[PDB]
Design a protein around this ligand. Structure first.
Ligand code: TBO
Lengths: 558, 427
């Protein structure tokens, strides 16, 4: 049958015209099929045979694809689809399972061939015209057109969604307490009603829709308790994704690493812990995907480390708006952090992690905060709340941290908790020039062409030093230069640099980086008691620079 | 209801397509408001539910107006306007009167409830497409349209100009110097009138207004005393770039002179007349930071000279109405903040500082958000336009909170600097 629903009008893109796409007449063999299939379709009302006053054509394909025992029909109006205007975005976003709430009974109904039942705007039909020639020559070119949403049509989905969205209305109005959601041509109806009593309404609906020519072949609401949605596997009280295998082989290539990494990130949501830093850092190579990737040891560690976790299967809970969402964090390692959102003690709702972002040298706290955000962000998108945060860090620390930073932020309601990794200010510079501390007019340089430099300085106490360097930038040398300053300096020190760079860098009070050079300086500052760094214009003619720059002659002259 | 007006036949700027912005997720508490708000509008036909034949969309936000009062809907009309209102501001060009900034006190009055009458060309509402979010994308989202004149839309005030004109004309005929200025749905009326004269003179208009078209305003101050805002009664005759003073370091120190020089060095870019050289000489040593070196008679002559070279500003004043104005913020100290708007790097038309000690409310974000808007005004006030804000904050952080403290009608285009300030001085 069909649905007497108020059709939706479609206009073709402004200044455009219907497809003149003819077809390489397919094998006269599968032509009898096309005809026989469309005769019924036409007899099912879905089609109206018309050939004269209509130029517009599209190719009619036909063969058999999956487990069926019959010939299938296909016709893609890609050409038309393009000529077609734009509608509303079907699913600009997928609902996240962790956001759902618990119900006693649920179920899913295949909305049959949803689209077909739905009527094409009376006009656009001319466009959906196609051609089924008889044989190779003996042929009248029997033309037909759709009166319903065609198999491969751009609007088809949008429309249909709208349609159904409507169709349910009165019903759902009358039967207010049974939430519904549609996905593709599928219907997810759930509620807190006694299996049979759940079955009571199911039918009521099943029937309701049936009044609209919408075919649902569910016998007594036929569904597989284990739901396979967007990878998730759901149940009226718990959700999880099961098919997740981290393959192990020898000839590890790129594509595989990526796949591993995708497969890994995916499970993280639910699996508390998963790491991917190395495996990912590795993928960093460019374009060649067919090549094999040398998973170094650091990699293997996290992999089988992860593997251990993956082996053991965990599950997640649903939402109860009558409670507080809670976000708890911890630093699982260098660069990596994790979170988990729960309502009641140890009943996992959601996990995941924030991977240290761009900006090579950062501070953990800053990072931690950068982390809290992502969390903040999700809770909104899901349960539209702000989870109260559980933060492994002191308030004095935090406080002083943000009271310091240049950029601005916002710490929600959060409590400090004692746990293993602790984010805190390791080192912390001075404010005013340290009295007595030997001043260090640190300097360095390098001839980019020569790829060689020199690091050194001259302390106020007529003291000098230098160290030549192979493979160094004016930048690297500068840090290096400060690093020396650090080594040679005492407990209290005044370091002076001409580095725009290092100036900023150290001031950023970052930590845990990949630049040994820096890591060291860091570790020294850590080791220290009172450092006062300061910055001045390299060539501006300060004599404090004049000399540290005048020593540069030992490499060359200019 | 059944009684309308005609429709200025509207059209987008030729060649462009309707806006298709993505609706930011908002809180449930916000959604609920918006469900309410827009339903009443479905009721009062000002707006209506649409279908899939429509793909456009423009952002919306819930906001507690005039001091956390019950909620207010806000469409982020930024794009559409830019897609219509621009070549449109070549026709209905609402004028900008310079001298206002010169006036002593100006107030703002939202003249938006007005537009909600005049219908819209049936072929343009198409663009008024706005969606309200279904938490966690569980539902398909409520999609409405606009039937009358949309508050955020820049094409609407332009239209309304007609009535507005006469609405005021008489009030203007009784009050001439009282300059009034319309920017979207806000009224800025300036005078050099004493506080209360101005004040009363204000409600005067408010009432007159109301009389002429149920153009109802906001009752900002009853006979009641409260700790509420001292109104949007700015005093633009007050604006300076003064505080960028050289520290008066009687105790000059190697460190200090250096610092000194440093500021002076970058400061050289904002005053190509300053030369610090002879001073640079005073610190040419490799001494102890904390050491006193005033001496150079020839140098302090430089201290003083440039020390005042500040007070006598440069050429940097050529408001290029073609170019866009750029705002830039500096988080100074506890509740200390700063900005500067220029169209060109050191051609900064005006700079200023925002102060509101982080304590009773230290939410940077809030103060930032506050500031922004407070800057926004100036700009409008003066050139009658919204700058481009360079926000010293995270996109994502900001993209999750301005909408909380944000109590303005319009929303300026902004961006975020992950670039710290060497510029960070006392200025
Ligand atoms: C994710 C999809 C298609 C959800 C549809 N879905 C069914 C469902 C399932 Cl399968 C598990 C827990 C669920 N929690 C909620 S609420 N629902 C729910 C209702 C909607 C009706």
């Amino acid at each position: 049958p069909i649905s007497p629903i108020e059709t939706v009008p479609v206009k073709l893109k402004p200044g455009m015209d219907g497809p003149k796409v003819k077809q390489w007449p397919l094998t006269e063999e599968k032509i009898k099929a096309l005809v026989e299939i469309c005769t019924e379709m036409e007899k099912e009302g879905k089609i109206s045979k018309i050939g004269p006053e209509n130029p517009y054509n599209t190719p009619v394909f036909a063969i058999k694809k999956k487990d069926s025992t019959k010939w299938r029909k296909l016709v893609d109006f890609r050409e038309l689809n393009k000529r077609t205007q734009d509608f509303w975005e079907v699913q600009l976003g997928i609902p996240h399972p962790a956001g759902l709430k618990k119900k006693k009974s649920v179920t899913v109904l295949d909305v049959g061939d949803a689209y077909f039942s739905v009527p094409l705007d009376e006009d656009f039909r001319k466009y959906t015209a196609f051609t089924i020639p008889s044989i190779n020559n003996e042929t009248p070119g029997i033309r037909y057109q759709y009166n319903v949403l065609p198999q491969g049509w751009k609007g088809s989905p949008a429309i249909f969604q709208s349609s159904m969205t409507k169709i349910l209305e009165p019903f759902k109005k009358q039967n207010p307490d049974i939430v519904i959601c549609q996905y593709m041509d599928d219907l997810y109806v759930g509620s807190d009603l006694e299996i049979g009593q759940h079955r009571t309404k199911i039918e009521e609906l099943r029937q309701h829709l049936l009044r609209w020519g919408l075919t649902t072949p569910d016998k007594k609401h036929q569904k597989e308790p284990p739901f396979l949605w967007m990878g998730y596997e759901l149940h009226p009280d718990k959700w999880t994704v099961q098919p997740i295998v981290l393959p192990e082989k020898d000839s590890w290539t790129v594509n595989d690493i990526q796949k591993l990494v995708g497969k890994l990130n995916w499970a993280s949501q639910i699996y508390p812990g998963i790491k991917v830093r190395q495996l990912s850092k590795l993928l960093r190579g460019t374009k060649a995907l067919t090549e094999v990737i040398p998973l170094t040891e650091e990699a293997e560690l996290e992999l089988a480390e992860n593997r251990e976790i993956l082996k053991e299967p965990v599950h997640g809970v649903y939402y109860d708006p009558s409670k507080d969402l809670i976000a708890e964090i911890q630093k699982q390692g260098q660069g990596q952090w994790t979170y988990q959102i729960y309502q009641e003690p140890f009943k996992n709702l959601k996990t995941g992690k924030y991977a240290r972002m761009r900006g090579a040298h950062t501070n953990d706290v800053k990072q931690l905060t950068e982390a809290v955000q992502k969390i903040t962000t999700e809770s909104i998108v899901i349960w539209g709340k702000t989870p109260k945060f559980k933060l492994p860090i002191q308030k004095e620390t935090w406080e002083t941290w943000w009271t310091e930073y240049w950029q601005a932020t916002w710490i929600p309601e959060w409590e400090f908790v004692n746990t293993p990794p602790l984010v805190k200010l390791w080192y912390q510079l001075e404010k005013e020039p340290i009295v007595g501390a030997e001043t260090f007019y640190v300097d360095g340089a390098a001839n980019r062409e020569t790829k060689l430099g020199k690091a050194g300085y001259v302390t106020n106490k007529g003291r000098q030093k230098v160290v030549p360097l192979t493979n160094t930038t004016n930048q690297k040398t500068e840090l290096q230069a400060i690093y020396l300053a650090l080594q040679d300096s005492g407990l209290e020190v005044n370091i002076v640099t001409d580095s725009q760079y290092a100036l900023g860098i150290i001031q950023a009070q970052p930590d845990k980086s990949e630049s040994e050079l820096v890591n060291q300086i860091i570790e020294q500052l850590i080791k220290k008691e009172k450092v006062y760094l300061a910055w001045v214009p390299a060539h501006k003619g300060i004599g404090g620079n004049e000399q540290v720059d005048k020593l540069v002659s030992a490499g060359i002259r200019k | 209801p059944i009684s309308p007006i005609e429709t200025v036949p509207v059209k987008l700027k030729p060649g462009m397509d309707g806006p298709k912005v993505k609706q930011w997720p908002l809180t449930e508490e916000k959604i609920k408001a918006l469900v309410e708000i827009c339903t009443e509008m479905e009721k009062e036909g000002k707006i209506s539910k649409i279908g899939p034949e429509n793909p456009y969309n423009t952002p919306v936000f819930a906001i507690k107006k005039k001091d956390s009062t019950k909620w207010r809907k806000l469409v982020d009309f930024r794009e559409l306007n830019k897609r219509t209102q621009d070549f449109w501001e070549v026709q209905l060009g609402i004028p900008h009167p310079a001298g206002l900034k010169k006036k002593k006190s100006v107030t703002v009055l939202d003249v938006g409830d007005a537009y909600f009458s005049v219908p819209l060309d049936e072929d343009f509402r198409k663009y008024t497409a706005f969606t309200i979010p279904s938490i966690n994308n569980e539902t398909p989202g409520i999609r409405y349209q606009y039937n009358v004149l949309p508050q955020g839309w820049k094409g609407s005030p332009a239209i309304f100009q007609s009535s507005m004109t006469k609405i005021l004309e008489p009030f203007k005929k009784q009050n001439p110097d009282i300059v009034i200025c319309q920017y979207m749905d806000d009224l800025y009326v300036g005078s050099d009138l004493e506080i209360g004269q101005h004040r009363t003179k204000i409600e005067e208009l408010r009432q007159h207004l109301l009389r002429w078209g149920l153009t109802t305003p906001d009752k900002k101050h009853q006979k009641e005393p409260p700790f509420l805002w001292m109104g949007y009664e700015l005093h633009p005759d007050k604006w300076t770039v003064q505080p960028i003073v050289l520290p008066e370091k009687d105790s000059w120190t190697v460190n200090d002179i250096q610092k000194l020089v440093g500021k002076l060095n970058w400061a050289s870019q904002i005053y190509p007349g300053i030369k610090v050289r002879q001073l640079s000489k005073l610190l040419r040593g490799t001494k102890a930071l904390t050491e006193v070196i005033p001496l150079t008679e020839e140098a302090e002559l430089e201290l003083a000279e440039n020390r005042e070279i500040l007070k006598e500003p440069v050429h940097g004043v050529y408001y290029d109405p073609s170019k866009d104005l750029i705002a830039e913020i500096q988080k100074q100290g506890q509740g200390q903040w700063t900005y500067q708007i220029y169209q060109e790097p050191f051609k900064n038309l005006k700079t200023g500082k925002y102060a509101r000690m982080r304590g009773a409310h230290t939410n940077d974000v809030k103060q930032l958000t506050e500031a922004v808007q407070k800057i926004t005004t100036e700009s409008i006030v003066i050139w009658g336009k919204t700058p481009k804000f360079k926000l010293p904050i995270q996109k994502e952080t900001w993209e999750t909170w301005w909408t909380e403290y944000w109590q303005a009608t319009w929303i300026p285009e902004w961006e975020f600097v992950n670039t710290p300030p060497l510029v960070k001085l006392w200025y």
